[PDB]
Amino acid sequence: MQEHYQPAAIEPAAQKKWDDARISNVSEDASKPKYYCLSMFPYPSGKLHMGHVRNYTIGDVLSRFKLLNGFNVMQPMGWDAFGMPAENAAMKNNVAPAAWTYDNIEYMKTQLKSLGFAVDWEREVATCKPEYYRWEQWLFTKLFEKGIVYRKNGTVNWDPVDQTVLANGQVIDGRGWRSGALIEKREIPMYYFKITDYAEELLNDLDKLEHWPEQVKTMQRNWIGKSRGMTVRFAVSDDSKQGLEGDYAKFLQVYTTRPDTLMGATYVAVAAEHPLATAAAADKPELQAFIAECKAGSVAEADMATMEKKGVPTGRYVVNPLNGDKLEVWIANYVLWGYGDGAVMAVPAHDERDFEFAAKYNLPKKQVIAVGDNAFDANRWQEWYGDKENGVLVNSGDLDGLDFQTAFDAVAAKLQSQGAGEPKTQYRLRDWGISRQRYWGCPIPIVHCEKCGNVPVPADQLPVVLPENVVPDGMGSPLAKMPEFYETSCPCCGGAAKRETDTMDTFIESSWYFFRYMSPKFSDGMVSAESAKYWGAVDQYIGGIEHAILHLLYARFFTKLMRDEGLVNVDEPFERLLTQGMVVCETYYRENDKGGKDWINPADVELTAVLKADGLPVVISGTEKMSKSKNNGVDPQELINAYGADTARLFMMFAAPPEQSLEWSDSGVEGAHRFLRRLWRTVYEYLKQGGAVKAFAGNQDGLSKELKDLRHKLHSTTAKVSDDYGRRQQFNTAIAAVMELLNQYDKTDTGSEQGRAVAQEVLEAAVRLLWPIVPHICETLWSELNGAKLWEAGWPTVDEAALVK
Ligand SMILES: [Mg+2]
Ligand SMILES: [Zn+2]
């Protein structure tokens, strides 16, 4: 055994030792309990960043910990290969997105292997290979025949300069974020997943997830947005029926979740596309300009509530069905066409959104709810205004004295007898649009025939192979310009027909990759029935915060879809969720000659804070998440080249808990490396003074007071580490517990015979307790202390007797 810790000399050897033993290559062995530990598979952007290393080290700790406890652990790895970054790099470097992707995959796979992750590489998948996406095309055709996937027209943002479709997040003040040209609203036929049919099932099944974070389940409930309310019809006044046709000339229909406050309605609001808005705007240019501004808006629902609410009066009036009040109709910008009736009622006294709207335009506020002896202030909103639980009705005539649910049914009874309303359940959830006007994505298995319509590609002719010999030019997506691709024959009649040129949303690949890992080479279905039965569902999921709501919802949707097709048996894909915190770092900038700032990477600077090149001082700015925005990203390959994989893994797990943000620190990295030097020195000095012995075990009566205390600290540390790994999922404190154990070991005389046995017992446990964190040095140190296989010795057991005083 060498005297000095040198990770470059032991880490390649430890990996080949695990590779030859094939401890990470697992099968459906019924003689062992299974454990599926899944980390979110990376996008092949070119090289790993710090978020990758932290995510997959967290997953490797939980995987190696469960492996030492006898579990048959599957920890797979793949590549979320589709996306736009390959197209943009293709337009910059003039290469093909496929070749650019496959090279990034090979390089990043070498980096992941160098980190020593216990990964079953025989289950590796790449979503851009036809061997993978052929099965999401298959499920598309099956759900298309059933109607779960359908085709309808939708509105998109067209950039006429870049000749591409943009999302609302890429539109700023009505212009494209790159071209700066005014976007155009176009209606094109697209494909949709009828996810609203599974809304009740997606909402109720959240109760089965006993181990999910309550805030994550709450975000799923809000996005689905189930509400039990009331449909209410306000009769249009005789002096406001001009220009209206059909039912819109008779009544204005609205939906409300607070029918107990129907007596407190002071005005109604309609969307810009509502027929009442169209009729009143026929002779009013202000209303026409307001309607045009609402239609030209490009607000994302993540910023919908942050939008300033605006409205215009119409001069048209409707009649409240309960008290007969005449209420003026307003055109509001927050009322969305397609959401319910496209019209709402307004109660400013018990809805803060209506309170701010009425206070702006000085609209009346009528109180109809009372909570105790609390005073009602018409010029200041209070939280109890919207209380549905402890409220009682006032200023409501016959409805006075009733609570929420009694007034709900009583209002329902009054409206149904008049034929002016009935209860209704609504959902904020929209259907899932999957059509993307991009090249680098999974093709849509639809052929357009003028005599047969939109016919699905039969299962024999799948996949619809995306051509890889394509270099995007920018002026339009390539698929719509390649007749050699879209010109084909109709699979129903054999006549001339055109393939679908749009590609699928990349969320589709991530909605079922956890099932493909179970049988990645299965060619008769999405997943074999044998492997799905054994592995069941993912026991532990580790990923980031980005797009968590949509990804989880889509993955839970695909699970129930595949279950209904008879492919899987579970109702939920993920039993446990661990979302890691971001990695932040300090930023550095030097002021410009044009009134700006140029941001410098931390690798090109040294703290005296001075630039590393010209030696001119550079401003050290604030800390934020590593990104190419302010050039603050630290390459983990430089961290591995300098200290090794074990130091990188240890610093990640020790600097902060997994959920908390990790702040980059050069001193913290050195401290992790010095501890690995200390651990190597401890084992080396122990073996230099006599070599290994048999670890102490059994009855400890007769040991000295000093040696009994060390065994107490030892088996107390083992209990604390097991709780940190298996329950708390707090790996930083577990490293601190082992450090305290080594501290007391240093202060203890282990020179006696039984003292050497206690020392052997202490060291054999410490290297096994840190094996999930730093497996390379622990495997190397374990072979010096004991001749058995580390994974066969298992997780260290707690000696209960070593705790009785
Ligand atoms: Mg349960
Ligand atoms: Zn045909």
Numbering used by the authors: 1 to 608, 618 to 814
How is this structure described in the published paper?
As the substrate-induced peptide-plane flip results from the clash with the incoming side chain of E169, we next generated a NgLeuRS-E169G mutant to investigate its corresponding effects on aminoacylation. These three structures can be fully overlaid with each other (and WT apo) with an all-atom RMSD of 0.186 Å indicating no obvious conformational changes between apo, pre-transition and intermediate states which strongly contrasts with what was observed for the WT enzyme.
To correctly aminoacylate tRNALeu, leucyl-tRNA synthetase (LeuRS) catalyzes three reactions: activation of leucine by ATP to form leucyl-adenylate (Leu-AMP), transfer of this amino acid to tRNALeu and post-transfer editing of any mischarged product. We have solved crystal structures for all enzymatic states of Neisseria gonorrhoeae LeuRS during Leu-AMP formation.
